[PDB]
Amino acid sequence: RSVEDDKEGHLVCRIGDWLQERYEIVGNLGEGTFGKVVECLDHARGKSQVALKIIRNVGKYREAARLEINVLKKIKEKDKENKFLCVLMSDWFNFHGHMCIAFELLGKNTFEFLKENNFQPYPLPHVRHMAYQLCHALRFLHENQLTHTDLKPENILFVNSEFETLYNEHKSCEEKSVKNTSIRVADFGSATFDHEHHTTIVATRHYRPPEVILELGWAQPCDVWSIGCILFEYYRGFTLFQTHENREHLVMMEKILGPIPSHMIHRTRKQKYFYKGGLVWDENSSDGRYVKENCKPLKSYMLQDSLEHVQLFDLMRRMLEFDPAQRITLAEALLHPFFAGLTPEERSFHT
Ligand SMILES: CN1CCCN(C)C(=O)COc2cc(ccc2OCC(=O)NC2CCCC2)Nc2ncnc3[nH]cc(c23)C1
Numbered sequence: 001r002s003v004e005d006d007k008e009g010h011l012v013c014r015i016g017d018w019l020q021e022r023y024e025i026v027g028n029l030g031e032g033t034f035g036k037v038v039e040c041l042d043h044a045r046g047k048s049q050v051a052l053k054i055i056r057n058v059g060k061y062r063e064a065a066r067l068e069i070n071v072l073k074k075i076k077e078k079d080k081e082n083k084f085l086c087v088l089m090s091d092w093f094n095f096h097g098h099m100c101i102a103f104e105l106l107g108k109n110t111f112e113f114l115k116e117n118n119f120q121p122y123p124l125p126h127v128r129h130m131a132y133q134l135c136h137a138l139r140f141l142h143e144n145q146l147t148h149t150d151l152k153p154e155n156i157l158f159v160n161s162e163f164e165t166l167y168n169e170h171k172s173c174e175e176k177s178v179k180n181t182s183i184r185v186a187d188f189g190s191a192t193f194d195h196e197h198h199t200t201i202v203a204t205r206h207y208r209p210p211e212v213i214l215e216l217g218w219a220q221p222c223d224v225w226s227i228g229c230i231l232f233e234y235y236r237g238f239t240l241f242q243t244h245e246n247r248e249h250l251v252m253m254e255k256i257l258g259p260i261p262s263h264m265i266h267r268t269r270k271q272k273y274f275y276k277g278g279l280v281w282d283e284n285s286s287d288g289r290y291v292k293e294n295c296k297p298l299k300s301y302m303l304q305d306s307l308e309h310v311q312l313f314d315l316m317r318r319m320l321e322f323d324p325a326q327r328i329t330l331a332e333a334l335l336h337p338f339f340a341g342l343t344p345e346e347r348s349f350h351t
Contacts, residue, residue, distance in 0.1 A: 068189035107161030228319030
């Protein structure tokens, strides 16, 4: 058996193949621009289930996965008992140029689940539990001088994504409801410690905070903004900022959240976004008309009036504060009355 790569550097993988004289491939899980995710049995560890992330054999991806491995090591040192809901590695190796990182086997990521539910949103109790877990996991990294920088639904995975199929009460359709809402945070390859180099731009655009857009520098509050975005997405089933471009995104922020504080406008070197101290944009352009038609004040997106919905929206708005210094921290978020709704099993992490 020659090892074969396709034209983009992906490993050609077959069921039955072994790697490191140990990992037997038994299924497919995923593929992205990074490589593939395959399900293996680990024959050195009693045929335990493994998700093996196999990185393209392309220098820059190999360099990034090396950075990811080094981060994952540091994270494990700080959480040896694996209590803080992070997806840590059990092993790593260079398989003929392909970096491979072995992880626990999980269910569907939270985007894929929403998508296979035809974008019907998670119910509030699931959203609440998921919020709590995310605040917990990330508070732990924040207190250990780490920022994730790339939180998004697809990097958050259910431990088990099995679901009940129910008839939607108020629509003429079926709905998939996850049976257990325990989640884990993955993909630490861009995670950055306080003392390490901070690139000008971080985050996937839809989850990217205004301080990064305005090139004001960033730290842990970046993750809080992303969390606010993710929670909106879970609750409504569509993205908060369905945007492709900076000026448009800022306009959306203004329409949904209110004016950008003038102290941030005064400090940014990105003055091309502003004119007479206000955002400058073409209301008659395609993006202009799109934003004017579609972006409404945040509170308008509430599905019900009841206390738990109001509390969710209070918390999201605090996570979506423009000023990163004023934005809610996750330690504070975990004291929010929204979380009074959690069952004792959810609150004590016995799910
Ligand atoms: C390695 N893994 C982070 C990888 C990087 N990352 C965050 C993603 O890629 C997100 O999207 C997926 C991740 C997994 C599987 C499928 C995904 O997408 C669907 C897709 O590709 N469909 C493909 C379409 C064609 C067929 C499959 N990941 C996991 N799945 C199961 N257990 C796991 N343990 C740890 C991980 C993991 C973390």
